[PDB]
RNA sequence: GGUGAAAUUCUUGGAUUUAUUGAAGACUAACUACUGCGAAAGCAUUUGCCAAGGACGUUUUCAUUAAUCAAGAACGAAAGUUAGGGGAUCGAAGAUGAUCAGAUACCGUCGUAGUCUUAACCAUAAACUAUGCCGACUAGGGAUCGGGUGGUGUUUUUUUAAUGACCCACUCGGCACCUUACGAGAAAUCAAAGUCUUUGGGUUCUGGGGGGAGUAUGGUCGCAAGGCUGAAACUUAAAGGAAUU
């Protein structure tokens, strides 16, 4: 059953620390926990060690990420404006 | 295109699936084709190669990881590598892709 | 431990020597392990190789920038942060860079930085929630945690200290020619208030 | 009432075209529902070309033309009597003069 | 034969600059204005200030070397009316009137791609 | 007095009273 | 009283080979002195001047042409290209309502490491024993010519050097080259390159401006 | 500078004006139309990629799979809200100069939020054609957009002259228009608002004199602003529509 309405994961704080705060927390602890594709081995196996670490269960592999995401928006936007640069550069 | 002439070879061809089952088909020189996935290990994928360059066979490169190969042979769990023993009506073989 | 940022151990090889050197690198963000990381003037441009500031195009995404050639890293180290190359001096080889503060820094075509931005950003954007947390937060750092307010204390522990209500009694912006002791608040303000515009 | 079938614009099968404003006083138009008139004048005059033609290097030259699109509202064309409020047949006639 | 300025009328509403400068553009011979004409503060941008402006301008043409001007007539452009003001017209014709002869007039109002907001509101300037 | 400040009123006089009904909760 | 005017040089300006008659005019500066020289003051001026006037023929009333100095010699200012544009009113002539403008620009580099901007206009055209009175292209047509008008501003840069680009714009011969080009697509009526803009510059290279004043 | 006329403001420390070169963010002029696309809201610089859609064509397939729809759902201008970015311009608030009897308005000069974007909310507009959707029929014309068909047509009039572009005649679909009033309407007007006392093709939603009132209360959604739902007491002889003088 659905336990709970609308706290989810924060459902763990009770009733402190203000509940825009407890909604901007179960935003990135959703995040932090979700389990991801890995991008060598294909499976839903990466979860977050430390922030900024994100290692796949199987296949043993391990990539720098963002604190509470794999990837990072600014980082996908960063990583295309090199491949960019990179391309303009080998043309 | 691809994934038509992959779709009907699986229907009415004779194939396998997996790495252990594609080299053994490469070793035993039963294999006319093999589609190896886009995030195969490099270590695989040049181990495949090299045995596929001693079985004389050709060699695609499916644009797609394991999980979008699996689908488009009709499966739901990853597969890596696939292995075309021998075609049905499909012309995969025949087309230059 | 104190750091936001995770760190790559890139393993090298000592030309002169048989031997391997390790190099312990801020870890930019899509850097994994078993990757090849590549630095030098011929490095090529891709995410966590390190090139001199000369040898990038315009735009370019750089972290662990030096401030001089050989520092081994200064700019853009803390999780989250970078610097864009916004120009190129050729005659006098000198490179346009800007500073996550936003300041326009000229820097010598011969500093490295490490292609990419430093990973783990993002991570201030979750309040903390709690003084606990603030507690390991400042364990592993240093000992600046909690702090008492000046105009909680006494007249003879804090310029701020004393009188029959918590008040500073005398503007808050102290002079940049202000001497130790006297430089509590906010000091060589330009300007104070909430910053509109 | 209704006053116009095209209810006081130019717009069937838009739901909404692009703001213009007005030239004279910079009201937001509907740039259908403006008034647009071509301001298509001599670069110097009509008494001043002889003027310039004996007091010029280069004679009889171009004598160029300063061209420009002139938007205006229903209010700041009325009051420039450029519109000049009809009768109630005469007002569905489109002819431009 | 003749030594060529240029002359960069700005007939804008509310003033008109007559203001001469060399050929390049760079370097300034005789800005002159509607307002150092008159002294009535309404009839700056109007027609005799403009013509007294332009003969002004004309009398240190000559004694310095410039004989002939091309005319660049410039009305406020950008977000604002496009159109010369009253001025323009007789800073123009003053000039051929007082001995310098002219080439090339060309209108140089700086116009827009559409652009930034015009002044005015929703509603515009209501009086 | 036109609908919507009439309707402007009215919605600040609203606000009114689900204020001081605020208080007496 | 100061009277600044008694105290300029008045040099004398002059314009590339790739021209007509190169005599544009004077120029008033200063007398060059130490303390802050007034020599180098003369090396950045940029002169816009009309093709009809550069070449004596009044079929190039419009196209200004813009020269930069680059080099002093003596009491003579040598130049050299800069940009091209057209006059104002001869844009608002050509642009009419009842018919499609097309426009197309690409940025492309010279042989000689010139980074220009090559832009291009293009208005469709009613043909002859036309009834219907707007001919608008359909799109298509508009990327099809877009795509023929970019290569052939590509094509004829890259070779062509700054010189000879220039020497290739006065007869207006990329004109010709597009309408043939573009005929069998859609019939146009006024082409033109319309605008030529420098992006990025080489070094200096003197022996190449000499070459450009006899 | 600005204005109707001024004042505020800046200005010999050089304002305004001129030239060269940058930076930032917006926006995409003219072409631009009784033209196009989208379910609507909306959508106009180039190119590349991605998925989609209408119409047309079809001697292709399936064979009733359909129409409209309580509950339920997606999208939904602007303003507004949250958290970052960005913040040039204009600019609710505010400040200031005028006008004026006053002017906390219009006019003038600044100027925060906002205006842009990302991730979420909101769910409202004279969100309009104030005109629900599907289907059939009833009158004449020309123009226009897209597709198609046919000219022993023009352009490439160069020995019997590609493909596009154009012209002519049809046709389907679409945005519209003009004439007339068969017919309708209270009229304005309307090819639908016609095929209605000679009243029935199918189906959804809504209204029952004007106010009180989209108010109070309750419920539900929303962070809030507010949205949806929604009275009664009381009060009144008109309120209202179209046209005539
Ligand atoms: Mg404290
Ligand atoms: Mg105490
Ligand atoms: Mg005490
Ligand atoms: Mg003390
Ligand atoms: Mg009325
Ligand atoms: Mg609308
Ligand atoms: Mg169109
Ligand atoms: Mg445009
Ligand atoms: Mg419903
Ligand atoms: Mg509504
Ligand atoms: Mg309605
Ligand atoms: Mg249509
Ligand atoms: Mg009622």
């Known amino acids: ?91 | ?97 | ?197 | ?97 | 034969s003749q030594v060529f300025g240029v002359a960069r009328i700005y007939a804008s509403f509310n003033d008109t600059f007559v203001h001469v400068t060399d050929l390049s553009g760079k370097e300034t011979i005789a800005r002159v204005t509607g307002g150092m004409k008159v002294k009535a503060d309404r009839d700056e941008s109007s027609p005799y200030a403009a013509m007294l402006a332009a003969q002004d301008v004309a009398a240190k043409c000559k004694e310095v070397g410039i004989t002939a001007v091309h005319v660049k007539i410039r009305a406020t452009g950008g977000t604002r009316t496009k159109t010369p003001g009253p001025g323009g017209q007789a800073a123009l014709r003053a000039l051929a009137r007082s001995g310098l002869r002219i080439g090339r007039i060309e209108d140089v109002t700086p116009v827009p791609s559409d652009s930034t907001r015009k002044k005015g509101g929703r509603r515009g300037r209501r009086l | ?25 | ?214």
């Open chain 2, 1 to 97: 295109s691809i994934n038509q002439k992959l779709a009907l070879v699986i229907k009415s061809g004779k194939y396998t699936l997996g790495y252990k089952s594609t080299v053994k088909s490469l070793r035993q020189g039963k294999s006319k084709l093999i589609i190896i996935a886009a995030n195969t290990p490099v270590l695989r994928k040049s181990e495949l190669e090299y045995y596929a360059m001693l079985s004389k066979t050709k060699v695609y490169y499916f644009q797609g990881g394991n999980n979008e190969l699996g689908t488009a042979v009709g499966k739901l769990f990853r597969v890596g590598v696939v292995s075309i023993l021998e075609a049905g009506d499909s012309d995969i073989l025949t087309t230059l892709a």
């Open chain 6, 1 to 25: 007095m036109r609908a919507k400040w009439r309707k402007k009123r009215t919605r600040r006089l609203k606000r009114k009273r689900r204020k001081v009904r605020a208080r007496s909760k």
């Open chain 7, 1 to 214: 009283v100061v009277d600044p005017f008694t105290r300029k040089e008045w040099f004398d300006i002059k314009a590339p080979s790739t021209f007509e008659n190169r005599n544009v005019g004077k120029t008033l500066v200063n007398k060059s002195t130490g303390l802050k020289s007034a020599s180098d003051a003369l090396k950045g001026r940029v002169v816009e001047v009309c093709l009809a006037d550069l070449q004596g023929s009044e079929d190039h009333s419009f196209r200004k042409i813009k020269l930069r100095v680059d080099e002093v010699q003596g009491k003579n200012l040598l130049t050299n290209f800069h940009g091209m544009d057209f006059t104002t009113d001869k844009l608002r002539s050509m642009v009419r309502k009842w018919q499609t403008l097309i426009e197309a620009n690409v940025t492309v580099k010279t042989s000689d490491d010139y980074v220009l901007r090559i832009f291009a206009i293009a208005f469709t055209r009613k043909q002859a024993n036309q009834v219907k009175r707007h001919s608008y292209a359909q799109s298509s047509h508009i990327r099809a010519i877009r795509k023929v008008i970019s290569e052939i501003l590509t094509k004829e840069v890259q070779g062509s050097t700054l010189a000879q680009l220039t020497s290739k714009l006065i007869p207006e011969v990329i004109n010709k080259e597009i309408e043939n080009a573009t005929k069998d697509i859609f019939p146009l009526q006024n082409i033109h390159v319309r605008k030529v803009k420098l992006l990025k510059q080489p070094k200096f290279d003197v022996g190449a401006l000499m070459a450009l004043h006899g």
């Open chain 3, 1 to 197: 431990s104190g750091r936001g940022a995770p760190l790559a151990k890139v393993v090298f090889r000592d030309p002169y020597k048989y031997r391997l050197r390790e190099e312990i690198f801020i870890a930019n963000e899509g850097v994994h392990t078993g990757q090849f990381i590549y630095a030098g003037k011929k490095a090529s441009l891709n995410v966590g190789n390190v090139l001199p500031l000369g040898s990038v195009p315009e735009g370019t995404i750089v972290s662990n920038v030096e401030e001089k050639p050989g520092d081994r890293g200064a700019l853009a180290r803390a999780s989250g942060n970078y610097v864009i190359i916004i120009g190129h001096n050729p005659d006098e080889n000198k490179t346009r860079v800007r500073l996550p503060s936003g300041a326009k820094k000229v820097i010598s075509s011969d500093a490295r930085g490490v292609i990419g931005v430093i990973a783990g950003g993002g991570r201030v954007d979750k309040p903390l929630l709690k003084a606990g947390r603030a507690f390991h937060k400042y364990r592993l750092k240093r000992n600046s945690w909690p702090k008492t307010r000046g105009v909680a204390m006494n007249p003879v522990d804090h310029p701020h200290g004393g009188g029959n209500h918590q008040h500073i009694g005398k503007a808050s912006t102290i002079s940049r020619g202000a001497v130790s002791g006297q430089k509590a608040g906010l000091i060589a303000a330009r300007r104070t208030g909430l910053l509109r515009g």
């Open chain 4, 1 to 97: 009432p209704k006053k116009r079938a095209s209810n006081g614009r130019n717009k069937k099968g838009r739901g909404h075209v692009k703001p213009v404003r007005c030239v004279n006083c910079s009201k937001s138009i509907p740039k259908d529902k403006a008034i647009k008139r071509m301001a298509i004048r001599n670069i110097v005059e009509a008494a001043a070309v002889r003027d310039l033609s004996e007091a010029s290097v280069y004679p009889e030259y171009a004598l160029p033309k300063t061209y420009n699109k002139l938007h205006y509202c229903v209010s700041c064309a009325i009051h420039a009597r450029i519109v000049r409020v009809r009768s109630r047949e005469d007002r569905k006639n489109r002819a431009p003069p």
């Open chain 1, 1 to 91: 059953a659905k336990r709970t309405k609308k706290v989810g994961i924060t459902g763990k704080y009770g009733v402190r620390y203000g509940s825009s705060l407890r909604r901007q927390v179960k935003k990135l602890e959703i995040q932090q926990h979700a389990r991801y594709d890995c991008s060598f081995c294909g499976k839903k196996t990466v979860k977050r060690g430390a922030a900024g670490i994100w290692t796949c269960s199987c296949c043993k592999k391990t990539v720098a990420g963002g604190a509470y995401t794999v990837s990072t928006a600014a980082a996908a936007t960063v990583r295309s404006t090199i491949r960019r640069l990179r391309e303009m550069v080998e043309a």
